[PDB]
Design a protein around this ligand. Structure first.
Ligand SMILES: COc1ccc(Oc2cc(N(C)CCOc3ccc(C[C@@H]4SC(=O)NC4=O)cc3)ncn2)cc1
Lengths: 263, 11
């Protein structure tokens, strides 16, 4: 380790410490729960309408709407965690405030789906800070148009989880996503790109130290960033459909804000 | 626009 490398390690450690502060349920905690290598009670499993209702002891809309709205509420909380984490990224708060807003607006769902993968396996997803586990088959079964809204996320997650990143890798990756110079409408790209270049150097060093076995993990990881955007644009289209067919539904105001003029 | 996001950022 030389001096520029050492600056890269300090950045990596700084981001990891903020990540743990900001995000209550880490991938490490999530993994223990899912394998059962944990000292906690195993989570309550929701595989049908009845288990969902019995689990609600651990409004009265139709179940598909309850579930979709539960997903919204989790994003609302995630946006808050991600915003706090973003503020800890060196140089982020010194950017033009409109640009900070634009980066968050475009970055949050990409981060949400990245981190949701930490909570997933091929059979289901942890919910409510790991107190629950909701089965993938149950989610597929919801009535249209809610029946397939999770499948692109599960599919992304099985591929992404094959990379076996840990929380220290993810902390940096998430920051790289937030500092994307190509977001529509940015006012001053150069200072964002300068920060992203350091973050990317830090990610690459991190991947080489923590995964010396896995050659070109860095390159594989960067290609996932393009897959994430597609998850998001497809999701926007499903929401357009949902808004048209269910006037029962109302979108949380934070989410309206984020989604407005997004793609 | 992005009133909540400003607020969360400026918080
Ligand atoms: C009271 O009993 C219950 C009621 C409901 C319930 O459903 C769930 C499901 C759930 N997941 C499936 C895990 C979280 O998946 C998510 C999926 C999509 C998003 C993106 C959201 S969606 C949108 O359009 N824009 C968004 O930003 C966020 C999270 N998480 C929490 N509750 C379980 C129990």
């Amino acid at each position: 380790l030389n001096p520029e490398s050492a600056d890269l390690r300090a950045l990596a450690k700084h981001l990891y410490d903020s990540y743990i502060k900001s995000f209550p349920l880490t991938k490490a905690k999530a993994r223990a729960i899912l394998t059962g290598k944990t000292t906690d009670k195993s989570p309550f499993v929701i595989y049908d309408m009845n288990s969902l209702m019995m689990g609600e002891d651990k409004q009265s809309k139709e179940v598909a709407i309850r579930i979709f709205q539960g997903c919204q509420f989790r994003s609302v909380e995630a946006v808050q965690e991600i915003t706090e984490y973003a503020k800890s990224i060196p140089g982020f708060v010194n950017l033009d405030l409109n640009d900070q807003v634009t980066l968050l607006k475009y970055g949050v769902h990409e981060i949400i789906y990245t981190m949701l993968a930490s909570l997933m396996n091929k059979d289901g997803v942890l919910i409510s800070e790991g107190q629950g586990f909701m089965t993938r088959e149950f989610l597929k079964s919801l009535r249209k148009p809610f029946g397939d809204f999770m499948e692109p996320k599960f599919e992304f997650a099985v591929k992404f989880n094959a990379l076996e990143l840990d929380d220290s890798d993810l902390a940096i990756f998430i920051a790289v996503i937030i500092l994307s110079g190509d977001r529509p409408g940015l006012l001053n790209v150069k200072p964002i790109e300068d920060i992203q270049d350091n973050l990317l150097q830090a990610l690459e060093l991190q991947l080489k130290l923590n995964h010396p076995e896995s050659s070109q993990l860095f390159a594989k990881l960067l290609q996932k960033m393009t897959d994430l955007r597609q998850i998001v644009t497809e999701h926007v289209q499903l929401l357009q459909v949902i808004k048209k067919t269910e006037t029962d539904m109302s979108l949380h105001p934070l989410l309206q804000e984020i989604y407005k003029d997004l793609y | 626009r992005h009133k909540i996001l400003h607020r969360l950022l400026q918080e």
